[PDB]
Symmetry: D5
Subunit: 184 residues, 10 copies
C-alpha cells in the first residue's frame, strides 16, 4: 500500500512548505507525485535477466560496437533532485552481441533509482559484462545536475563526465582511446 | 518559516517507502539536505516585491522599449513536483521610471521559486513589473522544458513550451508586441 | 485487442515469400516481435480522447497564446506502410481552460500511431484539442521526413514536408496566426 | 523472383487484422504499393557482386589511402522489420587496383537492401570490397539510427550506433586505422 | 530513342580535339559512359506528366497549405552545358485534391533533366502542379548554384540564385505568399 | 591550339542527337560557348610548371611546416566527363626554399583543369611541389564531391571522397603526417 | 594631478579589502589602475566636433546605411563594473554621410563614461543626429552586464537590448522594421 | 592605360620612405608586382558596360523576382586606399529581358575594381543593371567589412556595413522590397 | 571583516577625481553598492576550505577519472583590477574518496573571488582538491577572457587564455593527462 | 619619424597615375590619410622589445603550459603590399617567469605592423618571447587569409595559411608540442 502512503506524505509536504492541497492546481498532485516516484524508482525492482530477455545473438564480427547518445534521467541520492544526460556504451564481443534496444533498457534499470553519477556508470558497465561476458566494456556517462543548477552554487554551464572500463577497455590503451575518439 | 524538522521526517519516511535504506552512508544527511533545498525552492512565497526591488528604480532616459532577455529560471510544476526550467524574456516601454536590470532577475526568481504552471509564471512576472514601474506596457515571454514530460509519462525529448503575458501597449498595440517578439528572434 | 497470433503467421509467411529463411537464429522470434510492434504502432485507434486527457484540464491563467513546440512523433503512411516522422508544434489561445502540457504529447501519439497522411494528422490533432478545450482557437504544424520518399522510389534525401491546421482565431485572425508561426522560427 | 501477388494479399489482410479498412480511398492501392516496395527493399539478396561492380576497376594511381565517406544507406532490422539508416564510411589502401567511386555506393546498397543487423552490414561491405579489389587493407564504418529503438519499445531519441570492420592493413597497422578513423572526425 | 552510337562517336572525337588519348586505359569506355549519361540527363524531355504522377492523387484532408521543401535537383544550363543544382521548395493550397509527396520529386526531375534556365525551371514545375491538382494556388521556389559561374568565367564562389513562380492564391493573396516564403526560412 | 570550330560543330550535333532545337533562341550561341568553356577546362594540359610558378620562390624563414588549406578546385572526371570539386590542402617542410602562397593555387589549377581521377590529382600536385621546392617533404589532401555520383547513377547525396599523397618526411615521419592531418581538422 | 590621486586611492583600496600593496603582483597596480580609469572615462573630455573631424561627405544615394556590430565597453554607474556588447547604427541621409570609422569613434566617446545602457543608446543617436542632421537615425545597443553576472543575482544567459529612434526611424513604421530586420 | 613604370618607381620609393630596404631578397620584385596589382585593382575604370554584358541578354521566362545572392566583391576605399570586401546581393523583376547569371558578377567587379565608398558601389551596380535590362525594378544590397576600420584607427573587429539601392518597383512596391530583403535572411 | 565605510569614502572620492558628480541621482548610492560589491568579490580570502567542503566527501564508487567541466568563474586581475572570466574544468582519479560535485564550484569560487592571475588560479584550485581528497591525481584547466586586454590597452577581441595545473598521476602519466584533455574537446 | 610630407606627395601622384582625379571631394584628404595610415602600419620597425614588454614580467606560479590563443593580427605582405590577417596562438612553458598576457598582443603587433611573409612572423614572435622570458620552450601558430590571393591573381576564396615556430621543449618534446596544438582545436 505504498502509493497511498506516498500520497499522504506528499499532501503533508505541500502544507509544510506553505501551500494549500485544496486548491484546484494541487487536487490530484499527491496522487500524481506518488505514481511519478514509483516510476522513478522502478529500477530497484527490475531483474537484469528479464530486462535483456532473449535479445542476445551470435557475434557477426570482432570489431567494437558503439551505442552512443542513450539519454537518461536519474535522481541524485544527496538532494533527491534530477540529473540527466547521455550514456555512451562501447564493447568488443566474445561470441555474443546484444539487441541495441536492450542497452537503453539496462541504462533505464540503473538510472531509475537514487544515484551518484560515478556509480551509475559502473553498474551499467557491470550489467553489460554479466549479460554478454565480452572481451571488454566501456561506459561513459555525461550529465547535468539540477542540485547544482537550481540550488546551492547555481552554476549553469557545468556538466559531469563519469565512466567505467572493464576487460580490454581498461587494459588496452589503444582500444580505450578508439572508443573515446568515437564519442568526439 | 518552514518547519525543517517536519520536512526532514517526511523525507526520511519517503526514503523508506520507495524502498531505500535511510541508514546507508549516502542517505544519512539526505533528509536534512532535502529540507533545506525545498525551503530554498519555495522561498518565493515568503518574499515581498517592495523588498525585492529595493532602491533600484531610476528615472527613464528615453521612451524606447527596453528588452531584458535570457534570464534563466528554475521552477517546480505544481502538478508533479518535478522541475521545469528555461529562460524568461522581459520587454517594456517606460513612463518616467526604469528598473535596475538585476531586479528583473530577482522578480523572476521570486515567482519561480514556488510551485507553478508556466502560464501563471509569465503573468505574475509581468504584473509585478507593471506594479513596480507603472510603464506604458509590459511584455513577458517564458520558454521552458518540463521534466515531468521528459523524465516520465510521455517521455518526449525535443519539446519546449512557450507562454507569455502582455500588458498595456504590449497587449493593445500589435506593432509594439511584434517588435518585442522580433527582438527575441 | 489485436489478433497477435494471426499477425505472427502473416509475418512468418512474409519472411518466407521475400526469400528469407524463417528458421534463421536472427528471425526465429521475428514474427512475434513484429506482431507486438504493429499492435503498438496502431494502438491509436483503440484510444479514447477523454481517457487520454484524463481530466488534466485546468482554469486559464491568462489570455495569451500557449505554444507547445517540438513534440516528436512517429507514424506510418497509409500509402506504403513505411514510417514518416518529425515534430508537431501546437499553439492555442484559451477560453477559460488550459491543458496539462503532456496531454498534447498524448493527443499527438493517439493520432500518430495509426496509418496516416501528414495532412490528416495535423487536422485531427487540432480538432481533438478544439474539442477538449473549446479555445478561442488552435493552430497545429506538423513537419516530417518520409521514408517512402527517401529509402524507396524517388529516393530524395533533403526533403521535409510541412502540413498545418488552423481553427478559430488561428484561422480568422491573420495576426494571431503569424505570431504562432513566428514563434516556430 | 518475389511473388508480388502473395505479398499483396498478405498486406491486404495485415490491414484488416490491425483494425483498418482496405476499402478506404487512401488504402485502395496500398497492398500493391507495399509488395513492390518490399521487392525493392530486398533486391540486394538477388544481386551479383560481379555485375554490381560492372568491371569499373582501374589501375591504382598511388599507394595512399582512399576514403569514401558519407554514403547514406537504408536498411531493415531483421528483429523487428523496421528501418534503420545513416551513413557508411569506406577506406582502403590499393594494390594496383582502385574502384569507381560510384560502385562503392552500389556495393553498400547491395547489402543494405536486405534484412540486417548493423554489425553484419559493415562486415559484408568490407568483405565485398576485399573480394572485388585486392587491397592491402579495407576499413568500413557504419553509423545509423534505429527506428526500432526510436518509434517503439524504449523510445530513445538521441541514440546512434557505430559498427565497423577492418581487414588487411587496417587491422594490422594501428596507425593506418587511426588515420582512417581520424579522417571521419 | 536517343542515338547512343552517334553520341559515343561524337564523344570519342571530343576527347581527341581537346588533346587527349581516346585509347588510354581510363578513357576507352568513356564515350560509352558519357552517351548513357546524357540520355539519362535529358530523359525529362521524353516523359509524360500523366505517367509521372501515376494514380497518386487523393482527396484533400484539409484546406491548409502543404509545403514540400528541400527537394534536391540537378540540371544542365542550356547556355554552357554545365551543371547547376540545389533545391526546390513547393507550396500549395488544395481544392479537393492532394498529391502523393514523392510525385512532387518526380515532377521536379521531369523538368530538371533537360537543358534549362533556372527561371524556366521554377515556372514549368509550378505549371505542371497547377495542371495536375488544379489547386487554389501553387508556389515554387528554386535555389541553386551554377558551375558555369564558379568553375569557369567569373569563378565566383559564394553565389546562389533564387527563382520562383506563383500561381493562383500564391499570386493573389499576399499573406499566403508570405506565409509560404516564411516556412522556407 | 584547340580547334574551337571543330568543337562548335560537335557541340551543335550533340544538341540535335539528344532531341533539342539548335536553332532555338537560347541555344544559338551555345556550341560557341561550350567550345570556349572546354578549352579553358582543359588548359592545364597546355601549361608548363616552370611558367606557372614564375619566379616566386624565396628563401625559407624557418624549418617549420607550412600548411596551405582550403584551396578550392574544380575538375572533370575522365570516366563520365562530369565535374567533381572541393578543396585541396597542402602541407610541406621546406629545405632552404619556400613558395609564394598563391603559386600553390596555380599548381592545383594546372592539374585540375584536365580530365582526372581524384587519386591522380593528389599525386600530381604533390609531385609538382616536390619538383619545384625539393623540400624535406610534401603532403597533399584532396576532398571533393562528384556529380557523376550524385547527379547520375547511384545518386547518393551525402558522400565525399578523400585522396592524398605523401612525399619525403610526410611519408617517413609518422608524427609529421599526423601533425599535418590534425591541422586540417 | 589626478593620476597620482587615483594611485593613492587605489593603493588604499587594496589594503581595505585585505591585500598587500607590497607584494610583487601588486607593486605597479595602483599606477596601472589609475591609467586604466583615465582611459575608461576619457569620453567625458572628448568633443564631438573633433571626434568626427572632416569625415563628412556628400550622400551617394537615398537608402539606409547600416553599420552593425560595433563592439563597445562601458562601466555601469550603479556598481562601477563593466557592461559590453555591440552597437548597431542605422540612418537615412539628407545630403550628408559619415565616414564609417567615425561611428565607432562616436560610440567610444559615450561608452567610455559611467553609463546606463538606456542612456548610451540615446546619446549615440543624438550625436549622429547633430553631426549629420539625417532624415532619421536608429541605434540599438545590446550588452551583457557583469554587475548581473559576477555578483548579486548572478544570472549567466542574460543580455539587454536598448535603443533610440529619431526622425523617420521613429515616425515611419516600415523604415524602423527594415532597420531592425537587417540586424537579424 | 596605366603607366606601370611610373607606379613601379613610386612603389620603390614608398618602400624607402616607410623605412624598408628595396634591395632585400623579399622586396626585389615588389615595386613591379605592386604596379600590376594596382592596374588590376583599377581595371573597372576602363571597362565598358556593353562589352561586360557581351549580349548575354535573353527573353524573360516569367514575371517573378530573380535573386542572385552572395556575389563576393573586393574593393578599395577612396579615403584610405585600404581594402573593404564582402558580398553583393542582387534582385530584380524582368520586363521581357533577363541577364546571364555570370554577367551580374562581371558587373559587380566592374564597379568594385575602383576606388570607392560602399554607398556609391551599390547605386552604380543597380544603375548598371537598370541600364542593361529594362526591369520593372532592381534591388542591390552590399555588405562588407572595412579594413580601414579593422587594421587601423578605431580597430573595431565585429563591425560590418550594409548599403543598398532600390529602383523601379523595388522602391515603389513595399511588399516587393520586403520580399527581396527577406530572401537574404 | 571589510571596512565598508572606508570603501564607501574611497569610492565617493574616486567619483570626484574621475570627473563625475557624486551628488547626481544615478550615483548617490553608488559608493555603498560598490563597497558591498567588492566585499563580495573578495570574500574568497576570508573562506576556509574545510567549511567550503562541509560534509560532502563520500566513498569512491570506482577507480575511473571523474571530470567536472564548464564551471563558470569570475575573477579580478591583480594587475589592473578589471574582471577576467570564463570556465574551469576539473578532472581527478579517486583514491577511496570523491567530492560532492557542487563543492568543486564552491572551491572554484573561493579562489576566484580574490585578486588573481589565471596561472595561480588553476594551481590553487588543483591544490585545494588534492588537500581535500588526496586523490591519485588532479587536473585543472582554466579558460578565460580578460577585460584588461579587451576593454583597454591592446584592445584585442578574439583572444582567450588557457592555464592549467596537473598533480599526481595527471602530471606523471602522459596518457592520463591526454585523456583528461581529450574529454574537454 | 617617417617623412609624412613625402608619403603624401607619392600618394597624390599615385592617385593621378591610376587614372583618378586628386581634386575630387572624396580624395582631397586621401594622400594625408594614406600617409598617416602607412606610418601606423609600419610602426613595428620603430618599436623596441624591452619597451613593449615594459617590465610586466612576473614570477611563474606553476610549471604548466600557458596558452594565449586567438590574438588577432593584421599585416602587409612584402610581396604585393596587400593585407594578410588572421590570428596568432601562443603557448609556452615557464622557467621562473611569466609575461603579462596583453604583452603577447603587443609583441604580435610589433612584428605584424611591418611588411612580412607569414613564415617570418611566426618565427620572430616566438624568438621575441624566447628572449623576454627564456622559457623551457615556446610555440607560435599563425593562421591567416591573404588578400593578395583572393582579391587579385588566382582569386581563391576558401584558403587559409598556417605557419608556426617551435622553440625549446615545443621543438624537442613531441608530447608538449601535440598538447599545445590540441589546445588550438
Ligand atoms: Zn545532489
Ligand atoms: Zn508537471
Ligand atoms: Zn508513403
Ligand atoms: Zn530492431
Ligand atoms: Zn551557364
Ligand atoms: Zn565519374
Ligand atoms: Zn550595475
Ligand atoms: Zn577607409
Ligand atoms: Zn590585467
Ligand atoms: Zn602577397
Amino acid at each position: 500500500v505504498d502509493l497511498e502512503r506516498l500520497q499522504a506524505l506528499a499532501a503533508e509536504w505541500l502544507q509544510v512548505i506553505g501551500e494549500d492541497p485544496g486548491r484546484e492546481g494541487l487536487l490530484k498532485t499527491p496522487e500524481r507525485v506518488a505514481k511519478a516516484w514509483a516510476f522513478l524508482t522502478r529500477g530497484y525492482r527490475q531483474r537484469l535477466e528479464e530486462v535483456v530477455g532473449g535479445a542476445v545473438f551470435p557475434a557477426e564480427g570482432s570489431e567494437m560496437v558503439v551505442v552512443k547518445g542513450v539519454e537518461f534521467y536519474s535522481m541524485c541520492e544527496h538532494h533527491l533532485l534530477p540529473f540527466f544526460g547521455k550514456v555512451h556504451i562501447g564493447y568488443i564481443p566474445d561470441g555474443k552481441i546484444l539487441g541495441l534496444s536492450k542497452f537503453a533498457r539496462i541504462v533505464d534499470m540503473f538510472a531509475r533509482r537514487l544515484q551518484v553519477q560515478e556509480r551509475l556508470a559502473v553498474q551499467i558497465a557491470e550489467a553489460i559484462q554479466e549479460v554478454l561476458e565480452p572481451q571488454g566494456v566501456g561506459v561513459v556517462v555525461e550529465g547535468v545536475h539540477l542540485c547544482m543548477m537550481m540550488r546551492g552554487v547555481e552554476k549553469q554551464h557545468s556538466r559531469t563526465v563519469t565512466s567505467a572500463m572493464l576487460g580490454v577497455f581498461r587494459e588496452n590503451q589503444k582500444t580505450r582511446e578508439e572508443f573515446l575518439s568515437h564519442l568526439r
